[PDB]
Paper text:
The residues that form the canonical catalytic tetrad are contributed by the β2α2 loop (Asp-51 and Tyr-56), β3 (Lys-86) and loop A (His-119).
The crystal structure of the COR1.3 isoform (hereafter referred to as COR) was solved using molecular replacement and refined to a resolution of 2.4 Å. Although 1 mM NADPH and 1 mM codeine were present during crystallization, no electron density corresponding to NADPH was seen. Although weak electron density was seen in the active site at a location expected for codeine, this electron density was too weak to define a precise mode of binding. The crystal structure described in this paper thus represents an apoenzyme state with a well-defined binding pocket for the NADPH cofactor similar to that seen for other AKRs binding to either NADPH or NADH. The most notable structural feature of COR is the shifting of the β1α1 loop away from the cofactor binding tunnel, which is made particularly evident when compared with structures of CHR and 3α-HSD. The asymmetric unit of this crystal structure of apo-COR reveals three homodimers with C2 rotational symmetry. A single disulfide bond is formed between Cys-220 of each protomer near the bottom of the V-shaped cleft. The lack of conservation of the Cys-220 residue and the reported localization of COR in a reducing environment in the plant suggest that the intermolecular disulfide bond may be the result of purifying and crystallizing COR in an aerobic environment, even though reducing agent was present during purification, and protein samples were stored at –80 °C prior to crystallization.
Numbering used by the authors: 5 to 127, 133 to 319
Write the structure that this text describes.
């Protein structure tokens, strides 16, 4: 099945997880049925965020998955949620996590991440984007683990530069850095630093977010990946996701239909040859998921090069 990844703290992590559609609107009951279907197919790692108001759909799906005997216990699952920038302030982190736990109908999370390396004024508007205090927020994240409300803590979309900034006063180092990674964004430099510090790389937007406004077609319409997919008898989607795992990375994928989420679990039964990786290593680079919704002429980051340090 899905291999387990041993994180730096000893916590086991299912290498392949399923995320939630990045819609900052309410949750549909078709989302809940998709989560329940993933559990029935064989997914145990699920990745949500408080910014998408879809946690209650995952909480309902977990509850019904236990009712239907699909899983026998909650400790069979690896639930992850993220801290929204509006609550990315010291005294506001623990109320934020306890709210996500009440929405999820859970008592603890398996992993708690910081969504973006920025803060927001508690109330996209560009006047509200505020520079993050990495030391005080991470200390609150560190307390969230000590009190038992989460088993591990991490970060999302953190550059190698900003990681060292958070690693300075860190008592509990980040276990996971969830960043964009695909055959069009190799992240060699970031994966080089995280490997030497035992930070796990979890890849989002493995397919370039073809369905989102901030996405592109650089992965799904790649004629390089098409050629490999036919040689190996796979789809373009499985070639990209196999590449991420074969680089020693975790990955969260968004599955809107039972056809794809059944095929996604088959990336662990085959292997890309040595050339296949060399032909992919020379693919031109293009970052899809842009933080231009977080770029403010008044805030900490005003260009794409400052947010990503590239």
């Amino acid at each position: 099945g899905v291999p387990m990844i041993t994180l730096s703290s000893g916590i086991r992590m299912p290498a392949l997880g399923m995320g939630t559609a990045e819609t900052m609107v309410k949750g549909t009951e078709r989302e809940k049925l998709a989560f329940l279907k993933a559990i029935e197919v064989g997914y145990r790692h699920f990745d949500t965020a408080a910014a998408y108001q879809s946690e209650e759909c995952l909480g309902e799906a977990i509850a019904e998955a236990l009712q239907l005997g699909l899983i026998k216990s909650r400790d069979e699952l690896f639930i992850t949620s993220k801290l929204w920038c509006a609550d990315a302030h010291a005294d506001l982190v623990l109320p934020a996590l306890q709210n996500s736990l009440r929405n999820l109908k859970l008592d603890y999370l398996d992993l708690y991440l910081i969504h973006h390396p920025v803060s927001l004024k508690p109330g996209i508007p560009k006047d509200h984007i505020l520079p993050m205090d990495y030391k005080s927020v991470w200390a609150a994240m560190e307390e969230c683990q000590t009190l038992g409300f989460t088993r591990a803590i991490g970060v999302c979309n953190f550059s190698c530069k900003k990681l060292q900034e958070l690693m300075a006063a860190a008592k509990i180092p980040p276990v996971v850095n969830q960043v964009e990674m695909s055959p069009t964004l190799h992240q060699k430099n970031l994966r080089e630093y995280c490997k030497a510090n035992n930070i796990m790389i979890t890849a989002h937007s493995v397919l370039g977010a073809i369905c989102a406004p901030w996405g592109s077609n650089a992965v799904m319409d790649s004629k390089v990946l098409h050629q490999i997919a036919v040689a190996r008898g796979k789809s373009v989607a499985q070639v990209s996701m196999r590449w991420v795992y074969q680089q020693g990375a975790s990955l969260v994928v968004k599955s809107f239909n039972e056809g794809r989420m059944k095929e996604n679990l088959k990336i662990f039964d085959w292997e890309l040859t040595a050339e296949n990786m060399e032909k992919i290593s020379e693919i031109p680079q293009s970052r899809t998921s842009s933080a231009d919704f977080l770029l403010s002429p008044t805030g900490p980051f005003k260009t794409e090069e400052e947010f990503w340090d590239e």
